[PDB]
Ligand binder design. Structure first.
Ligand SMILES: [Cu+2]
Ligand SMILES: [Cu+2]
Length: 128
């Protein structure tokens, strides 16, 4: 089974997927994030941040408060399971994380933590 996904965030605050499936036999999983828009990082930055569903609101809230130089994530936030860096127009970032962080049946959310973006830029991740 494949163990990666390619995702885009654009100038309209849209991800091109709202649901990610990680195959149970994967030991690592890779997320390839790209920004095909034209707007720069400081006004339309996008990251891909993963947490349990219950933790998302907290991660997003503290994140936005943390500011651009911290990629809109609270330092040493143990609620973040895995995340890309924050990127603007024309950039791309890839992260690979351990599936051992992803328990069978548990509910996970991915989202962008750039201010205001998470309402429209979010989706589910599950291990099947
Ligand atoms: Cu495989
Ligand atoms: Cu964003």
């Amino acid at each position: 089974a494949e163990c990666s996904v390619d995702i885009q965030g654009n100038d309209q605050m849209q991800f091109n997927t709202n649901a990610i499936t990680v195959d149970k036999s994967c030991k690592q999983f890779t997320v390839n994030l790209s920004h095909p828009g034209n707007l720069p990082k400081n006004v339309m930055g996008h990251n891909w941040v993963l947490s349990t569903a219950a933790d998302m609101q907290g991660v997003v809230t503290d994140g936005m408060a943390s500011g651009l130089d911290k990629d809109y994530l609270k330092p040493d936030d143990s609620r973040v399971i895995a995340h890309t860096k924050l990127i603007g127009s024309g950039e791309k970032d890839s992260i690979t994380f351990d599936v051992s962080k992803l328990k069978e049946g548990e509910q996970f959310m991915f989202f962008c933590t750039f201010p205001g973006h998470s309402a429209l830029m979010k989706g589910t991740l599950t291990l099947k």
